Amino acid sequence: LYIQNY
Q: How far apart are the first and last CA of the chain?
A: 17
CA–CA separation, 6 vs 2, rounded Å? 13
**HEC readout, 1-6:** CCCCCC
